[PDB]
């Protein structure tokens, strides 16, 4: 019992993205819908390999949203370039100052700007969209950020500025290489690696310092 051919706009046979156990997302076909216990499960046959039975927060539509349809806090899958499809949260919507991109805070802590054609809406997000973020530090951060929005204290940094930036519990000598909207590209001077970090993050010493006085 409990088999369904549709659940609103989720129709058996549609194209879909599904979350694999690797936490990367892959294209496939929605092959079944079933009510099991408190909710529905969605069976996905992936194009490349495999089948999965997934909750509604672990499938995404195979289309890009009209930008207008997404908000800060929206649950999305986005192209994670360091390319994979990975889940995250919309932290900022398109504006001229961000070159009309979405800022994504990914589930592992990564941040990037993506274009409108690089994200996919999760089909049935949780009402509090951060509640399915596995990493508790990430989960807590997103709840704080979304709840506080649009109050976003940020540090004004300039290319060439020297600051300490936190990473793995250590505060490292670092240099500001570039500013891009709400992100700064930080060069870690000891190891020579760059990281794009949110300008409101307390990993940046000036933000840490302010929050610690403040609280």
């Amino acid at each position: 019992g409990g088999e369904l051919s549709k659940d609103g706009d989720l129709i058996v046979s549609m194209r879909i993205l599904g979350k694999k156990r690797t936490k990367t997302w892959h294209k496939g076909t929605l092959i079944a819908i079933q009510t099991v216990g408190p909710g529905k499960k969605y069976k996905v046959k992936f194009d490349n390999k495999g089948k999965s039975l997934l909750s509604g927060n672990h499938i995404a539509y195979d289309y890009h949203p009209p930008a207008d349809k997404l908000y800060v806090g929206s649950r999305v899958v986005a192209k994670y370039k360091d390319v994979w499809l990975y889940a995250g949260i919309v932290a900022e919507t398109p504006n001229v100052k961000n070159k009309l991109r979405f800022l994504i805070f990914f589930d592992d802590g990564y941040a990037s700007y993506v274009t409108q054609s690089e994200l996919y809406p999760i089909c049935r997000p949780l009402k509090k969209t951060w509640e399915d973020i596995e990493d508790i530090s990430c989960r807590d951060f997103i709840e704080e950020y979304v709840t506080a929005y649009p109050n976003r204290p940020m540090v004004l940094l300039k290319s060439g500025q020297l600051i300490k930036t936190e990473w793995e519990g250590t505060w490292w000598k670092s240099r500001v290489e570039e500013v891009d909207g709400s992100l700064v590209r930080i060069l870690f001077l000891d190891d020579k690696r760059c990281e794009w970090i949110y300008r409101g993050s307390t990993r940046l010493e000036p933000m840490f310092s302010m929050k610690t006085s403040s609280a």
Binding site: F105, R203, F208
Partner: peptide, 9 residues
């Protein structure tokens, strides 16, 4: 690689 959004606890 990523250090996430807040310092390590």
């Amino acid at each position: 690689s990523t250090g996430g959004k807040a310092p390590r606890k």
